Amino acid sequence: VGACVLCNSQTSLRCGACIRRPFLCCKCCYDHVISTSHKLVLSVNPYVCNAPGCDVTDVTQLYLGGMSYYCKSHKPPISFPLCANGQVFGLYKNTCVGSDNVTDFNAIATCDWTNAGDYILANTCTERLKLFAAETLKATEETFKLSYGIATVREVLSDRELHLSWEVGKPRPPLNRNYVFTGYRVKVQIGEYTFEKGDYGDAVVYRGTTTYKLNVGDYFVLTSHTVMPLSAPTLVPQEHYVRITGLYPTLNISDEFSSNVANYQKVGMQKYSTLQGPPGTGKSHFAIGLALYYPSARIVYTACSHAAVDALCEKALKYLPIDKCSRIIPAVECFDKFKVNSTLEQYVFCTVNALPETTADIVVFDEISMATNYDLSVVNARLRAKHYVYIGDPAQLPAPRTLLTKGTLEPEYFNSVCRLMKTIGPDMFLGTCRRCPAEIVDTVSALVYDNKLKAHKDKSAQCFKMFYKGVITHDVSSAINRPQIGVVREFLTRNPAWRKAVFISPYNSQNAVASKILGLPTQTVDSSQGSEYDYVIFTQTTETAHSCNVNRFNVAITRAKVGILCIMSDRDLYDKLQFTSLEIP
Amino acid sequence: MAVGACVLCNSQTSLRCGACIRRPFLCCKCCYDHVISTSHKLVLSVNPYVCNAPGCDVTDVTQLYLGGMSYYCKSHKPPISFPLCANGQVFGLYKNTCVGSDNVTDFNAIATCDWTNAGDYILANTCTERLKLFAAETLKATEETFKLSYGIATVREVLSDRELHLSWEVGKPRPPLNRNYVFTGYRVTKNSKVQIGEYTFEKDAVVYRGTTTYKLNVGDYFVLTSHTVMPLSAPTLVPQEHYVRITGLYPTLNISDEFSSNVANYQKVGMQKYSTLQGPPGTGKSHFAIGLALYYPSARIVYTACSHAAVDALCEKALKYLPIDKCSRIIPARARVECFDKFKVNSTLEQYVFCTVNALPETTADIVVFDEISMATNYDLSVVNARLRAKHYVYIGDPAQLPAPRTLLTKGTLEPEYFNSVCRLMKTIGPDMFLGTCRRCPAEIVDTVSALVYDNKLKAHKDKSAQCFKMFYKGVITHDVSSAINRPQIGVVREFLTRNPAWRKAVFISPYNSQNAVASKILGLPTQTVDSSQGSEYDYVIFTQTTETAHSCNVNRFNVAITRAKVGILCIMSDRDLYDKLQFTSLEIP
Ligand SMILES: [Zn+2]
Ligand SMILES: [Zn+2]
Ligand SMILES: [Zn+2]
Ligand SMILES: [Zn+2]
Ligand SMILES: [Zn+2]
Ligand SMILES: [Zn+2]
């Protein structure tokens, strides 16, 4: 017995076919079962046929026979169907309300989350359907990992490479950071690993958790936890105040953070606030300066990824008292220059999924484009705060929707925060890029930021572009372009000053091939977000939708502080690059 | 001609913009608004607005003055003078009766774009009707003039009557060697030269197909075939007129049950001025267009379309149902391309006239049937209404099928609502008629494209053939001068071919003709391209996606590609997106 998810009317009915088993009242449960393939209704007892050996569980074929339930072939004379007059029979049938958005619920409840419109709907529906979609989406993700085969250790080459055997028949998962395995030995549980495909032979690369000498015969399954029910909304109702409510602003604010004076004020005069901080505009600067402007404020700094949390720590290590900070870590080697798992310190740095239950004066949520609605709900459910600051850039990378194979997910459907930034606009917008040369800045400014991103630097005259399709050779789940490595290898002898450049490409395997030939430090576009380097060498590798994504390209070319070389494959993005075109050797 | 009507507000003028490839007439007001907000500074009157001093190269109208009785710059102007471009106007005739425009912004973006972005065509299909025509002429003249920028090819070595080696001019670009780029061949004689027909190339050597058939020698050279672009006058669509009863058209008393499921649509045609027909693959567009004449047996009908092959298919259908003495196939004497020869030639007054848009005469008709409307541009639509003053207009085609190859468009994807005016109505307000039953394809293909591009409104006639297969295999992509090559994908078909020998009757279809050429060397099947297979049908089809690019993943291209099969189809897919949309049987990769 609980509350219907659509209209909160109390009910004893749950849909036995939905993966979340939501509470649906008599009318909502009717409108769900008649227009979907979901027919199993659970109550204080399941709505199945009470006859010996009968397997009729379809509620639309079931009848209320006194106290029991029956199909047509086993019903008593005095009986009527459970589904009639727009209601499924159940407790509190007289006290129903019904809903006006059952249509969206049906599509959320029955989709397989492979289409982009499944995520669009999960972000344009009501708040209670946003939580149900996140539960159902994550439950489908965890369940779908069951179909992937187990990874058997075929050979242990080194402490960082090995050979894997794959189960015949069952599909194989893409080997990157998004897929996390659990290792067994036959009876110990070996640990928690990830995989990546290098360049030497059939060998993969592993980055494990608990140290262990894994032997031939060990098998890796996949890391699947349990999806917890959501209770808190993605965004609490916005509260506006005319004075700074709940905070004590300082009057001796240093020069470094005086430009953001009209910003932390807005943080104090609102319940939540959204700041869009494009690359190199001092996002982390704004976040840390909030702590100095409100020096007594207990502040929780959180993000999804460990690297985004660690970056906030390295910036905090410079301007904040070390003993008043803590890095919350769950049982990846992350920031380790604070005191670990000290929940009560004034400044808490912690990933979303590992957050504890506490309160705070201000909560800062960074890298908001990487956040899912599930994450937004968890933050509100774990952190009771006077002010929530959501920091990120909808024109940067989103969370990896592993099931999404059909369609393109636009930034306004990443989460509730990104949706507001793309519709009513963000509350604050850091519009001066102080990292990149004018060529890069002006390129992304017209590419994603609608000419709002301004350059604090001159043209560097060291940003070059080259159109050179080359040869694309794919492997197990990545792409490789050696001819594009060939151009860069040529470039590194003609321009020996660029030997200090970082190689960036949309693919892990090409980076390993880049490392093998060039020797440059390699970095995927995913792991490069929130980072900066003087020189950057980028090969687009392929002409796919993955390497042509403008958000991925925005992050890629905005890693440079001095110069960049873009070996391009797609015509449009090359023609949109405001760089000096180079002649093909 | 120095005097005409302003292209924006129709006021008479003695001014034309010399920087615009079309030299449109612009009034005193419109000319000023155009020159001051763009880089177009050359204005033409009876004489060009340029400085007439010995040795001066000043041609900016904003730096010139009318002095004495000529045009001079600031350095050379006589004391008594006045500026040519000032006070909101460029000087010229009828300076008191000018109207001006409300927004030249659309005209300026049409007149200064390079037509390499998809947004350039979006504007060309959303502007006012007079700007659609100007944008049609501007795009078309840009295409033809850019053709002249390519280098000339020369035969250096002949390998057979199919393959030959080409020599190319140094320093000039070389055209992509596909079926879209047609060349005019030339052979050298004692003096001068002579034209030896038209040719297309494919795939280090190339394979050629000619309008005629010579055993061409070394030294023959090919220049991309260029065409002049006439000015446009008529709209892309006539004004709409819904009538109370069937006007100018008389139904038949009894009718065949071949075209019985079209009687509702046939009456819809006869009560509104123009009408649209969306007909998916299979379906039977030509059967409908011909049966329309049997419902109004006395109606004069002009069947038109862009390509000769599209007009030829209507002739073959009319040969089966319409009197042959009632049909005339119009063939322009210019360019003698092999077309339909079973009808009398160039009889404009015949009851059934079959003619391409480019060769249309100036006549009238009870009904005009414009077939394959997705392949048309707004230029074609304007020509049809300028040459053919009809009583009804029926546009047949499919917005989900391929459009005219926009050769200049290399950045962005053009959506069906921006193909032309007719597809714009079909994609927004919906087509007047829809043929919802597909007779050609096995049910797997039909349910796919019905859920892919047809809103599940396309109904399968056949059953599940159980011979529709799909494989996910990216393989190895290699590029050459103008296409791509996926040898591992062809090597995948080879293991499949020796496993299923009956599939040697299948047609090979890949988005690029380079991958096609390599298939006819390891496999052997007859190869086609999605654009070179539109309209026709085959038993078995073997499709290799080759790449994951926007060209290989175009939903319209993939819609046409997979709907060429009557029985079975094998898809070696690169895109996970379209692979998962294919309701086919999957296979493991050996
Ligand atoms: Zn359900
Ligand atoms: Zn309810
Ligand atoms: Zn029963
Ligand atoms: Zn002009
Ligand atoms: Zn005018
Ligand atoms: Zn002069």
Side-chain angles (χ1 to χ4, degrees), chain A residues 1-26 28-92 94-99 102-159 161-176 178-186 188-199 201-206 208 210-212 214-383 385-515 517-582 584-585, chain B residues 1-94 96-101 104-161 164-178 180-189 192-202 204-208 210 212-214 216-333 335-388 390-504 506-520 522-587 589-590:
Chain A
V1 181
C4 179
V5 283
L6 270 348
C7 66
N8 251 332
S9 308
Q10 198 132 65
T11 172
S12 72
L13 306 174
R14 297 169 301 145
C15 178
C18 284
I19 200 174
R20 298 312 299 163
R21 314 287 252 273
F23 281 102
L24 295 170
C25 70
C26 296
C28 291
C29 183
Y30 176 91
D31 308 307
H32 183 44
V33 297
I34 65 155
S35 36
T36 56
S37 63
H38 287 197
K39 314 297 181 182
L40 176 54
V41 178
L42 313 182
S43 186
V44 181
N45 16 31
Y47 286 5
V48 311
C49 189
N50 203 33
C54 188
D55 28 58
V56 172
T57 59
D58 185 319
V59 72
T60 60
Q61 315 307 310
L62 277 208
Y63 291 79
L64 172 57
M67 296 300 292
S68 305
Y69 316 104
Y70 306 90
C71 74
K72 180 58 73 188
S73 296
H74 304 113
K75 80 189 193 73
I78 305 270
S79 55
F80 48 81
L82 303 176
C83 307
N85 302 319
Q87 277 183 249
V88 168
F89 177 79
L91 275 52
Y92 310 177
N94 66 328
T95 61
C96 289
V97 172
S99 182
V102 191
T103 300
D104 297 337
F105 170 81
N106 288 323
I108 294 167
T110 49
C111 64
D112 56 12
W113 304 96
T114 58
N115 309 278
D118 297 351
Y119 304 87
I120 298 181
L121 181 60
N123 288 277
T124 54
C125 55
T126 52
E127 190 66 28
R128 196 59 208 273
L129 279 185
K130 286 197 197 180
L131 307 182
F132 175 77
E135 297 189 25
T136 309
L137 167 58
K138 193 183 189 192
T140 310
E141 292 170 327
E142 296 295 88
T143 287
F144 187 81
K145 305 200 301 93
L146 201 72
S147 67
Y148 289 121
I150 310 182
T152 307
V153 168
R154 183 179 175 89
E155 187 106 301
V156 186
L157 259 298
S158 63
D159 54 27
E161 271 181 89
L162 50 72
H163 281 325
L164 287 176
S165 283
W166 288 108
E167 278 176 358
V168 173
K170 299 174 92 176
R172 154 259 173 184
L175 305 183
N176 57 46
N178 308 320
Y179 292 76
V180 183
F181 287 78
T182 338
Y184 296 80
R185 183 178 307 163
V186 182
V188 204
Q189 249 263 92
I190 289 310
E192 198 188 282
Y193 288 72
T194 54
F195 290 117
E196 191 212 283
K197 215 269 176 296
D199 78 284
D202 204 275
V204 315
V205 175
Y206 63 102
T210 165
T211 166
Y212 221 176
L214 70 182
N215 312 332
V216 165
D218 303 4
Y219 64 85
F220 297 63
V221 53
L222 260 170
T223 302
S224 147
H225 350 302
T226 296
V227 183
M228 299 289 292
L230 296 179
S231 52
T234 62
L235 285 188
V236 298
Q238 176 72 300
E239 294 176 353
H240 283 102
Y241 326 106
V242 85
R243 303 193 313 271
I244 288 105
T245 298
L247 290 156
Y248 304 99
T250 194
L251 279 150
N252 284 12
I253 178 63
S254 62
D255 290 356
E256 297 194 39
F257 309 94
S258 53
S259 62
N260 301 325
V261 157
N263 275 1
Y264 316 143
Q265 255 78 321
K266 171 168 289 179
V267 165
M269 312 197 307
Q270 288 180 343
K271 173 55 77 77
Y272 66 77
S273 55
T274 59
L275 176 133
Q276 179 180 12
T281 66
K283 270 197 310 96
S284 327
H285 203 66
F286 171 97
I288 294 300
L290 196 58
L292 302 169
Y293 194 74
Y294 303 114
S296 324
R298 152 103 164 172
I299 294 189
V300 166
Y301 288 101
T302 198
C304 298
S305 63
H306 277 296
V309 177
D310 299 339
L312 276 169
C313 300
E314 286 288 348
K315 194 107 170 199
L317 193 61
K318 314 189 292 187
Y319 300 156
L320 299 185
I322 178 145
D323 67 318
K324 308 200 316 174
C325 300
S326 181
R327 180 65 167 83
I328 310 299
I329 302 176
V332 156
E333 272 156 357
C334 55
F335 190 82
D336 222 11
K337 263 159 286 304
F338 285 155
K339 69 179 71 58
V340 183
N341 303 335
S342 189
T343 311
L344 259 192
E345 313 293 336
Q346 181 184 356
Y347 301 116
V348 176
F349 305 87
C350 180
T351 59
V352 170
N353 34 272
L355 274 177
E357 293 185 62
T358 181
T359 189
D361 271 55
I362 286 184
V363 160
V364 175
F365 198 158
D366 190 43
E367 208 171 35
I368 203 61
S369 77
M370 290 292 307
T372 57
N373 277 338
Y374 199 96
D375 294 318
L376 291 184
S377 171
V378 173
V379 161
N380 283 317
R382 304 237 184 111
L383 310 182
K386 306 170 186 174
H387 308 270
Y388 299 88
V389 185
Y390 296 101
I391 303 183
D393 194 5
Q396 293 188 47
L397 297 180
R401 276 81 177 178
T402 52
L403 308 181
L404 171 55
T405 65
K406 286 162 287 188
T408 309
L409 189 56
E410 295 297 328
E412 56 176 311
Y413 311 113
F414 290 167
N415 49 50
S416 304
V417 178
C418 288
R419 180 141 180 83
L420 289 189
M421 287 182 171
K422 306 292 296 189
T423 46
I424 51 158
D427 295 291
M428 303 153 292
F429 175 74
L430 316 181
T432 295
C433 175
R434 320 190 195 268
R435 174 200 305 177
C436 310
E439 301 94 329
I440 301 175
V441 173
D442 296 334
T443 297
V444 306
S445 189
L447 187 74
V448 289
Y449 300 121
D450 290 354
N451 312 322
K452 288 187 81 180
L453 187 56
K454 312 305 176 189
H456 195 268
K457 295 192 181 183
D458 203 312
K459 280 192 177 65
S460 72
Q462 298 171 42
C463 304
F464 304 99
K465 60 174 176 182
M466 199 180 309
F467 176 47
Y468 172 77
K469 310 258 194 186
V471 168
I472 297 161
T473 75
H474 308 255
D475 40 61
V476 292
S477 55
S478 178
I480 291 179
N481 194 326
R482 275 184 221 270
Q484 286 195 342
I485 291 296
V487 167
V488 175
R489 171 204 54 187
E490 232 186 307
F491 180 88
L492 293 191
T493 51
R494 273 56 141 180
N495 313 71
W498 286 68
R499 282 285 176 92
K500 59 174 72 70
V502 161
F503 190 93
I504 291 183
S505 74
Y507 299 99
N508 43 329
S509 65
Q510 163 111 333
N511 293 5
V513 173
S515 160
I517 296 184
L518 297 168
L520 303 179
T522 57
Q523 179 98 130
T524 72
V525 187
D526 317 297
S527 49
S528 91
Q529 180 164 314
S531 305
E532 55 181 0
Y533 318 90
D534 279 309
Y535 286 86
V536 167
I537 301 180
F538 174 83
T539 65
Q540 196 177 13
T541 314
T542 63
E543 220 167 347
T544 67
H546 174 70
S547 67
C548 281
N549 189 275
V550 301
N551 284 31
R552 187 156 296 104
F553 195 53
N554 176 31
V555 176
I557 65 174
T558 50
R559 308 300 95 189
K561 298 181 298 171
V562 177
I564 187 178
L565 167 63
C566 279
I567 306 304
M568 298 299 293
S569 292
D570 158 74
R571 198 69 227 256
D572 177 32
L573 291 178
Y574 173 91
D575 280 5
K576 289 186 172 179
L577 280 189
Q578 302 180 15
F579 296 163
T580 300
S581 64
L582 285 179
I584 296 91
Chain B
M1 196 72 261
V3 189
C6 177
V7 81
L8 296 192
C9 65
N10 306 281
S11 302
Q12 281 291 289
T13 326
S14 66
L15 302 184
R16 284 163 297 153
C17 174
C20 281
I21 65 178
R22 296 305 299 175
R23 313 213 201 289
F25 289 97
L26 290 179
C27 74
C28 297
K29 309 190 178 188
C30 286
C31 195
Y32 168 93
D33 297 310
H34 173 37
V35 296
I36 70 160
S37 49
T38 61
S39 68
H40 292 198
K41 306 299 180 185
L42 172 61
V43 176
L44 307 181
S45 192
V46 181
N47 299 117
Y49 281 176
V50 300
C51 186
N52 279 90
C56 201
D57 64 335
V58 169
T59 61
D60 190 319
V61 67
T62 56
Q63 308 172 10
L64 294 165
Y65 304 75
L66 176 45
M69 246 325 293
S70 188
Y71 319 114
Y72 306 99
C73 75
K74 156 74 149 298
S75 301
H76 305 123
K77 58 178 232 59
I80 307 172
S81 64
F82 63 90
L84 285 176
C85 176
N87 204 30
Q89 294 193 8
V90 182
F91 178 74
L93 291 178
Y94 321 109
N96 301 318
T97 58
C98 313
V99 169
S101 120
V104 191
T105 304
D106 286 339
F107 176 85
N108 292 338
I110 290 171
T112 55
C113 56
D114 58 343
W115 309 107
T116 57
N117 271 114
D120 294 328
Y121 305 86
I122 296 178
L123 170 60
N125 260 276
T126 57
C127 48
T128 80
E129 193 66 18
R130 193 57 181 95
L131 282 179
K132 287 190 208 291
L133 309 187
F134 176 78
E137 305 182 25
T138 302
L139 165 67
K140 203 167 199 312
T142 310
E143 295 167 338
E144 302 304 290
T145 300
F146 178 75
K147 282 188 177 64
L148 307 179
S149 70
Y150 281 102
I152 296 180
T154 290
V155 170
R156 68 151 185 259
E157 169 179 7
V158 287
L159 303 183
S160 58
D161 37 69
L164 64 87
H165 285 282
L166 282 171
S167 294
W168 291 95
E169 284 185 320
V170 299
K172 308 197 68 171
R174 50 179 59 204
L177 298 172
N178 49 69
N180 296 339
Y181 294 100
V182 184
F183 297 80
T184 301
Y186 294 91
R187 185 170 297 172
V188 182
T189 62
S192 170
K193 28 105 178 192
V194 67
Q195 179 176 333
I196 60 175
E198 287 181 82
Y199 302 87
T200 60
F201 301 104
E202 191 146 319
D204 154 82
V206 310
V207 174
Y208 72 103
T212 157
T213 35
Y214 298 76
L216 31 72
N217 344 118
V218 159
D220 296 327
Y221 67 94
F222 307 93
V223 187
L224 262 164
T225 302
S226 178
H227 287 287
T228 158
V229 176
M230 291 295 109
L232 295 174
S233 61
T236 66
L237 291 169
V238 294
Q240 187 62 287
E241 288 188 72
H242 294 247
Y243 304 89
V244 136
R245 43 171 39 248
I246 293 181
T247 305
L249 303 177
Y250 300 87
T252 175
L253 301 191
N254 20 58
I255 210 263
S256 166
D257 55 292
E258 286 240 25
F259 325 88
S260 59
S261 49
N262 298 326
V263 178
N265 296 337
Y266 288 160
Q267 296 180 1
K268 210 21 87 177
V269 156
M271 293 185 294
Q272 46 188 82
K273 162 63 71 177
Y274 71 88
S275 12
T276 68
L277 202 205
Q278 171 170 9
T283 278
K285 285 171 278 297
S286 295
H287 191 262
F288 171 99
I290 292 310
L292 177 58
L294 296 171
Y295 197 68
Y296 313 106
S298 55
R300 165 166 166 82
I301 304 190
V302 178
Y303 290 93
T304 192
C306 288
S307 65
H308 290 276
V311 181
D312 287 355
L314 287 157
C315 294
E316 291 290 342
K317 196 73 52 176
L319 196 56
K320 187 176 180 175
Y321 297 91
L322 305 183
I324 196 177
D325 24 0
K326 286 293 135 303
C327 303
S328 179
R329 177 63 161 90
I330 302 279
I331 306 168
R336 312 92 196 260
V337 49
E338 307 269 12
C339 71
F340 195 74
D341 60 10
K342 257 75 100 65
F343 290 158
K344 76 167 64 64
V345 177
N346 293 335
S347 182
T348 309
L349 298 104
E350 211 62 55
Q351 183 183 345
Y352 302 120
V353 179
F354 301 80
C355 186
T356 60
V357 181
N358 57 41
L360 277 174
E362 202 173 276
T363 182
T364 78
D366 296 279
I367 303 172
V368 167
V369 177
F370 197 150
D371 189 47
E372 203 182 19
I373 198 65
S374 74
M375 284 293 181
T377 66
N378 279 334
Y379 191 92
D380 302 314
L381 304 187
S382 170
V383 166
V384 169
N385 294 328
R387 309 296 291 188
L388 303 182
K391 284 170 170 169
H392 299 263
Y393 292 78
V394 193
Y395 300 92
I396 304 181
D398 203 11
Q401 297 190 47
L402 289 179
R406 268 87 179 183
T407 53
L408 297 187
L409 172 58
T410 72
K411 310 147 50 189
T413 289
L414 196 54
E415 298 295 87
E417 60 173 318
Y418 306 117
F419 289 173
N420 61 77
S421 303
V422 177
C423 299
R424 178 150 183 77
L425 291 180
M426 292 190 182
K427 290 291 296 180
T428 58
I429 70 171
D432 293 293
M433 297 151 236
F434 185 80
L435 310 174
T437 319
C438 168
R439 307 206 67 198
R440 164 192 309 166
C441 304
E444 302 90 314
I445 292 172
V446 200
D447 310 340
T448 297
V449 305
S450 204
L452 184 54
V453 291
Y454 295 126
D455 188 74
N456 286 266
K457 301 193 308 164
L458 188 60
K459 306 308 178 183
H461 178 47
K462 302 184 176 177
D463 292 325
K464 302 279 203 61
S465 65
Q467 292 199 289
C468 302
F469 301 85
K470 66 181 182 175
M471 192 186 306
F472 185 71
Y473 186 80
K474 306 184 185 181
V476 171
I477 303 179
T478 64
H479 302 73
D480 55 310
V481 256
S482 56
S483 287
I485 285 176
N486 210 317
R487 295 181 185 272
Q489 284 191 347
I490 282 167
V492 151
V493 181
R494 254 193 71 263
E495 178 81 42
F496 173 85
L497 277 191
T498 76
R499 240 121 157 87
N500 305 76
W503 286 72
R504 262 105 181 191
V507 179
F508 193 98
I509 296 185
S510 71
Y512 317 95
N513 27 259
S514 185
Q515 181 76 350
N516 279 11
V518 198
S520 320
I522 335 183
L523 317 175
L525 331 154
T527 56
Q528 232 53 247
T529 64
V530 180
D531 219 292
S532 69
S533 72
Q534 172 140 318
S536 82
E537 50 191 21
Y538 312 101
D539 291 356
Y540 291 116
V541 171
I542 293 186
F543 179 92
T544 52
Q545 200 173 26
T546 326
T547 68
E548 300 202 32
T549 74
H551 167 254
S552 97
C553 291
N554 181 268
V555 292
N556 281 35
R557 173 157 298 101
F558 201 70
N559 177 37
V560 168
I562 70 177
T563 55
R564 306 301 95 189
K566 285 176 298 148
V567 178
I569 174 157
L570 175 68
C571 282
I572 315 300
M573 294 296 295
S574 296
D575 187 11
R576 175 63 174 272
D577 197 321
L578 273 300
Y579 174 87
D580 289 348
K581 278 156 177 170
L582 284 180
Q583 307 183 31
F584 292 179
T585 308
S586 73
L587 311 156
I589 308 98

